Amino acid sequence: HPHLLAERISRLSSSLEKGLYERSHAIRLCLLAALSGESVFLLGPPGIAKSLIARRLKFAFQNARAFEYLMTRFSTPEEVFGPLSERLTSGYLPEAEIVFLDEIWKAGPAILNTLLTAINERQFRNGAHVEKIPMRLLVAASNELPEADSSLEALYDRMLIRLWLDKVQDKANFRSMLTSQQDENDNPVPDALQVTDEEYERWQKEIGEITLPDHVFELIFMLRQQLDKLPDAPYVSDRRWKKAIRLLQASAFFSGRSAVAPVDLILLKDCLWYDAQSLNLIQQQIDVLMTGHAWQQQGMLTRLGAIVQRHLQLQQQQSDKTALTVIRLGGIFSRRQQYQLPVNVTASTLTLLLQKPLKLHDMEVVHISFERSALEQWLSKGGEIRGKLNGIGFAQKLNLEVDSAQHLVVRDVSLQGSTLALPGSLPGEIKQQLEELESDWRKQHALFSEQQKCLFIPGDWLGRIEASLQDVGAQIRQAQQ
Amino acid sequence: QNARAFEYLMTRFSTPEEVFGPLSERLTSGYLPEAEIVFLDEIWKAGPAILN
Ligand SMILES: Nc1ncnc2c1ncn2[C@@H]1O[C@H](COP(=O)(O)OP(=O)(O)O)[C@@H](O)[C@H]1O
């Protein structure tokens, strides 16, 4: 039964996208809010099918009445909700399933004060007594943004979904859209896919009963603190976080799942932002968490570094078995020219370990990576040589010299000798920790391949999650070589 | 030991006949005149009759 619900939801939105190109993220987002009792905000230039989406969602229900209205600076509440005689509200707002209000950032004060009570309570003041409003979806579109200190900020804080629609950009999708014969005022949804009034009231009870896992809630446990330490981060109150749980629980209910999935957190990119400055910060902070702390991407990166550090520690401890012999050469030269090993070493940026560690540049080091292009000139011509510490930083100058037993001695500030050595040709402890970390990467990748088929997930976001998981698996495979 | 609560959201459509109780002389059983702890959320939006 729960698995068959994802087929009907995926088939319902397929018929609604007939005639609307590059609008898949706008139709699937309005469908989730219509079946859960939420709202959706649209922002963009006038002329991007912002009014057709308000008239297409009414076809999914058996008994749904649409309402299109443009809020003006001189508009009166008697034209939106209905004029009084006791109020003739036949076919307006109190008895409408889907209402559309274009340009909400310019209405009168009498309309804005009454619009805040029709969302939190879904009631209307019909003169004396009050009556419920069966509003299933509230969509509002405009073009500009409200002021930072005005009376229009109360309605913006209550709107959960805030989408930023724009014009088309693909050339192939523009030719089919420019020449479309599909009627926008017809009914392209079959009767078998239309939901009834009994199914809408039953789904509202099963949404709040969705189990909340502890591992999925760990993402919001850390992402909430990231939006508070940065001054450029938008202010997200507790009312916005409480309404985001209803949208996240309903996203997995219509996808054939019983619990909240970590992949449903991508919908927060259109709910926390509020202007053009917060758009580049919300989409960047979520992308880091979705490619870091989501599928244990960043959790395995910091754990892999401990295995590499442990492997280098065991290599420098057993360096007394393999030394470093430097062969000599004949010829006629004024200086004692030395030659390196032939086929024994062929890498350019090879690493050389050491026995007793020293303090170079007021810091410790365990391995010094030299360059094959500069080692041949120092062993023959002479002079000074450079080299970075711990394989990082700039190539600093060291006190390298030759020894009596054909070895390399590195001195510091206290004239301390240290014979260098090269790493030999995997210990049992390193292979044990590497096998356990590789098993966690395969288990985490299996969870992403079982929940990515959700309908409320954009298509361009799948290319970044797959590329991030492949980067972690490619770094662990290089250490076991 | 004997404390009666009263949780009512103060809305702009609220009337004095609902917060304190409707009249018949006023049915104020379990409202505001006979309550130990009263809670009124959002008080900056009530009417002039309730504020007075
Ligand atoms: N991006 C788009 N893709 C497909 N059709 C579109 C698009 N933008 C507009 N249209 C078509 O243009 C018609 C009129 O749209 P309109 O209601 O003026 O948009 P808006 O409400 O944004 O001004 C609609 O019937 C719709 O089919």
Curated annotation (Swiss-Prot), chain B:
<comment type="subunit">
    <text>Homohexamer. Interacts with ViaA. Interacts with specific subunits of the NADH-quinone oxidoreductase complex (NDH-1 or Nuo complex), particularly with NuoA and NuoF under aerobic conditions, and with the fused NuoCD under anaerobic conditions. Interacts strongly with the inducible lysine decarboxylase CadA/LdcI, forming a large cage-like structure composed of two CadA/LdcI decamers and five RavA hexamers. Does not interact with the constitutive lysine decarboxylase LdcC. Interactions with ViaA or CadA/LdcI and phosphatidylglycerol are mutually exclusive.</text>
</comment>
<comment type="similarity">
    <text>Belongs to the RavA family.</text>
</comment>
<comment type="function">
    <text>The RavA-ViaA system is involved in the regulation of two respiratory complexes, the fumarate reductase (Frd) electron transport complex and the NADH-quinone oxidoreductase complex (NDH-1 or Nuo complex). It modulates the activity of the Frd complex, signifying a potential regulatory function during bacterial anaerobic respiration with fumarate as the terminal electron acceptor. Interaction of RavA-ViaA with FrdA results in a decrease in Frd activity. It also interacts with the Nuo complex, known to be involved in both the aerobic and the anaerobic respiration.</text>
</comment>
<comment type="function">
    <text>Component of the RavA-ViaA chaperone complex, which may act on the membrane to optimize the function of some of the respiratory chains. RavA functions as an ATPase.</text>
</comment>
<protein>
    <recommendedName>
        <fullName>Regulatory ATPase RavA</fullName>
    </recommendedName>
</protein>
